[PDB]
Amino acid sequence: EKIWRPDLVLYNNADGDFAIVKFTKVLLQYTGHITWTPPAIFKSYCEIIVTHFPFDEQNCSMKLGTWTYDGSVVAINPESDQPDLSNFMESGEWVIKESRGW
Amino acid sequence: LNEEERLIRHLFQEKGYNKELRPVAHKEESVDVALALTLSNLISLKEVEETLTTNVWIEHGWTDNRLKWNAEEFGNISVLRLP
Amino acid sequence: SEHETRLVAKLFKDYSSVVRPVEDHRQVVEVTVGLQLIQLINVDEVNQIVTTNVRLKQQWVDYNLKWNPDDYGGVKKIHIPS
Amino acid sequence: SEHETRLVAKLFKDYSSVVRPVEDHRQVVEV
Amino acid sequence: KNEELRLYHHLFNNYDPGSRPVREPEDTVTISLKVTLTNLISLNEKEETLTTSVWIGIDWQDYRLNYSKDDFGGIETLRVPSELVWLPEIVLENNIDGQFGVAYDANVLVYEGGSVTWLPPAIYRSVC
Ligand SMILES: *[C@@H]1O[C@H](CO)[C@@H](O[C@@H]2O[C@H](CO)[C@@H](O)[C@H](O)[C@H]2NC(C)=O)[C@H](O)[C@H]1NC(C)=O
Numbered sequence: 001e002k003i004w005r006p007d008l009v010l011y012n013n014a015d016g017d018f019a020i021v022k023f024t025k026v027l028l029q030y031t032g033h034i035t036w037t038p039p040a041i042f043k044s045y046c047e048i049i050v051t052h053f054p055f056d057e058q059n060c061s062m063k064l065g066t067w068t069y070d071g072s073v074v075a076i077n078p079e080s081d082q083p084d085l086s087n088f089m090e091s092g093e094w095v096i097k098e099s100r101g102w
Numbered sequence: 103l104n105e106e107e108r109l110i111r112h113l114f115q116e117k118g119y120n121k122e123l124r125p126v127a128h129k130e131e132s133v134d135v136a137l138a139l140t141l142s143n144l145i146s147l148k149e150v151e152e153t154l155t156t157n158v159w160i161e162h163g164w165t166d167n168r169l170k171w172n173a174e175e176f177g178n179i180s181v182l183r184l185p
Numbered sequence: 186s187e188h189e190t191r192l193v194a195k196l197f198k199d200y201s202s203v204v205r206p207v208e209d210h211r212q213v214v215e216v217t218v219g220l221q222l223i224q225l226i227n228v229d230e231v232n233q234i235v236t237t238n239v240r241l242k243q244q245w246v247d248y249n250l251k252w253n254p255d256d257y258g259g260v261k262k263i264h265i266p267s
Numbered sequence: 268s269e270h271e272t273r274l275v276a277k278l279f280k281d282y283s284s285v286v287r288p289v290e291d292h293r294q295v296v297e298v
Numbered sequence: 299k300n301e302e303l304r305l306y307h308h309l310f311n312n313y314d315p316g317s318r319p320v321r322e323p324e325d326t327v328t329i330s331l332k333v334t335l336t337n338l339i340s341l342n343e344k345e346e347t348l349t350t351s352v353w354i355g356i357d358w359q360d361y362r363l364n365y366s367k368d369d370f371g372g373i374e375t376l377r378v379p380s381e382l383v384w385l386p387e388i389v390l391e392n393n394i395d396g397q398f399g400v401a402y403d404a405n406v407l408v409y410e411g412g413s414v415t416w417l418p419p420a421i422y423r424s425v426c
């Protein structure tokens with residue numbers, strides 16, 4: 001809470017929080033590098049195509065961006081081409097066939 | 103309320119009241135706290151959740167000897183309402 | 186409004202929100218209370234609860250929050266956090 | 268930690284969380 | 299030496315967010331209003347409640363926050379937290395759940411010439 005942070009907001013928030021509300025600590029190196037890894041519950045809006053239900057495939061998106069800073073003052077870059085699923089808990093109802101960040 | 107303002111200033115600013123410390127002369131002493139409960143209304147008892155919802159008023163009484171004053175010296179004030 | 190800034194600084198220099206706002210502690214604070222019912226949200230017959238949306242208008246005089254408008258550029262009213 | 272206490276006091280003596288954290292305003296914060 | 303810091307100190311060293319931005323008490327502040335609907339979440343008919351996601355754009359002039367880019371290295375926009383500036387305090391009056399304000403308190407953008415813009419997002423549950 002004491003430092004400047006980027007104001008990332010979930011554009012397609014449906015009925016949750018738009019921004020980060022759980023302000024966990026940042027790790028600061030002597031070089032000024034900051035790593036901040038807050039948690040969040042994203043309640044995003046997804047168009048659910050029910051045509052093949054219960055054999056249906058869905059494509060749920062999460063659009064994230066700095067709300068009040070444009071690209072000329074703050075630039076966001078993906079850490080990797082894909083979301084990190086290393087700690088993902090297995091779902092008893094869904095299988096993630098694909099995942100990608102653009 | 104010149105008198106209530108003066109009394110509050112005397113009790114808290116002048117004497118240096120510290121709300122973090124208990125009202126005791128020595129640490130080994132204990133503070134007597136008397137409790138009573140008034141049931142305003144029994145809202146519900148949910149069986150599936152096994153939960154009782156009640157509206158209660160909790161009457162607390164204790165003594166804080168740091169908050170003592172002689173009323174005649176402060177316009178015969180006998181009681182104060184404080185946050 | 187520089188006048189309002191100076192006014193608010195003066196009004197809350199030695200102000201106490203704990204103390205009742207009249208000149209003598211033997212005097213009573215006179216409060217006018219009015220209720221505005223905006224909506225009757227729901228009647229719960231099981232738990233016997235009526236939920237309503239209301240506005241609770243409260244009017245009273247604060248003795249220590251007076252000023253002369255001429256000394257503050259004609260400012261006759263201000264908005265203050267409750 | 269006395270060293271970390273002193274460092275934390277020093278870092279936030281004249282710190283501002285309002286402006287973007289760049290030496291020059293024409294630089295872009297890379298996130 | 300970041301010029302944003304100098305501009306911020308110039309604009310906010312002596313500034314009262316409690317007072318309206320009017321030179322005289324009898325002047326009026328004009329607020330240019332825009333409401334952008336991004337999604338109609340639902341209409342719950344049992345509770346008679348419309349849930350919508352919007353952005354409330356409000357623009358106005360604050361003469362106290364007036365600055366020229368030439369005096370501050372060409373800065374044309376400064377982002378500051380909305381709590382540091384006066385706001386008109388726009389609320390949804392016909393809300394049903396008691397939530398009057400916006401969902402996320404975004405920064406205001408202060409443009410040269412004293413032009414303040416605020417575009418927070420909001421989830422509103424309104425009576426219908
Ligand atoms: C912000 O300041 C500038 C001046 O730097 C104001 O522009 C002036 O507008 C007036 C007429 O009202 C002219 O006579 C001037 O020539 C302009 N500038 C100068 C330097 O004289 C501008 O109006 C201000 N914005 C406000 C008041 O919000």
Ligand SMILES: *[C@H]1O[C@H](CO)[C@@H](O)[C@H](O)[C@H]1NC(C)=O
Nearest residue numbers: 173174175176177178179180
């Ligand atoms: C308290 O002091 C006042 C002023 O001396 C006196 O008139 C009054 O009788 C005293 N006692 C009470 C109970 O008011």
Ligand SMILES: CC(=O)OCC[N+](C)(C)C
Nearest residue numbers: 066067068404407417418
């Ligand atoms: C400047 C500002 O607050 O803009 C918010 C809207 N957005 C994220 C689409 C640009």
